Design a protein around this nucleic acid. Structure first.
Lengths: 122, 122, 122, 122
RNA sequence: CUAGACGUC
RNA sequence: GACGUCUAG
RNA sequence: CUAGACGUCUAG
RNA sequence: CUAGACGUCUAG
């Protein structure tokens, strides 16, 4: 399975667009492709859904049960302005703690070119 | 001159915990113990230290300068989940080439019960 | 200044290997890198040395004088056994209090897979 | 294939008792066992048989063709008297060079507890 | 771990 | 500054 | 020269 | 164990 196919598959289950969970889909598929775990993640998403878990719940479970998400920091994405971040994410931005953890809700860190940093927290 | 004393000596010089180099210590000491070459391995480790080599570089020198590490394949270590691999090792896992060699940086091969196989590469 | 460069600078002034101060160097450089205080830490280290303080004293003064080490808790490090902690650090290990502070000598917290927790205290 | 079964497969081709070659069978099976090379060693034993080589010759072909036997030293076997060595081996004992190698005919080293040492050379 | 060469915003 | 590949210790 | 041997060395 | 190379000795 490809990262794009899993992204699309996870998306078709998500309500709205550009929410924190879409960003999390992006992060999960990115890191998962980077260490050849797309397969396992796919399996876990499917399991979780089949178990009656909501897709957001499933994604969170991936963050907690897939080992790579315990060891990687939330990815840093460089952006231009705070307005580049989708509106559904706006009210979910907050100053980053010393060690933000993916399995504790930290999807990514938005590092702006003027120095500012805002974390995306679920 | 025991595998444990050598393990402890090497660990005492290394930064971090559960890193690729700790695992490499494990492999080096296993093979050395298995063929009574511990003394040699030790001699080479301190010779390298005497050359100004980093402890990491020294372990690598062991693999390059002691001939047996040219002849044995990276060991296969069977594990249940990928989460049995230490956190520091996670970002060093990658698909194995056809004939991976220890003296080229391939510490070991992790065989997962789900079929997956990933090599540990420095 | 990069964390690795600062790490080597600080190491070059430290006696022995795998002491509590080596691990403390690792902690200081890790956190300092996590928020660009590398410059500040470097300046502080160098000023202290020029004033005639031992490098050990300089490191401790860092934990006391640089504000980040009063806002962050001692990092938690996952390891398998107590025998993974370097020998020079062994007699410096002890049960952790409720709120260990970096500026009070608490370098890191070792979390073992047996549940047990040991702090490294200077 | 276990070390004992292969030991026997190798024995069943050998004449006499307590010969240098029975001892060599032991050395080969030990080393192959220690580095999990029993399968390949076996494979070479029959390849040699398929060439029409004498079984003794076949074993020597193992020493020549599987690389590890260039790199592990002849094993030290501790004994009490020279009369502890099987008689068929007596006529093959002689002083050991600084670095005796298995692929050059040095099966093992007989070490007396008084310190004196005799090599077994085919 | 580190060095060299090359590629990418 | 962040990545990638190859090579070497 | 031929044939039996013993040593040394090389090779499988 | 086997084959080469080189010496040596013994015999015819």
């Amino acid at each position: 399975i490809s990262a794009k196919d899993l992204k699309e598959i996870m998306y078709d289950h998500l309500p709205g667009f550009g929410t924190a969970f879409h960003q999390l889909v992006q992060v999960i598929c990115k890191i998962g492709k980077d260490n050849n775990l797309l397969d396992t993640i796919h399996a876990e998403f499917q399991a979780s859904l089949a178990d009656g878990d909501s897709p957001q719940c499933a994604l969170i479970q991936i963050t907690k049960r897939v080992p790579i998400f315990q060891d990687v920091p939330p990815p840093i994405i460089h952006i231009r302005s705070r307005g580049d971040i989708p509106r559904a994410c706006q009210k979910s931005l907050r100053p980053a703690p010393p060690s933000p953890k993916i399995d504790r809700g930290w999807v990514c860190l938005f590092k702006m070119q003027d120095g500012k940093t805002l974390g995306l927290k679920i």
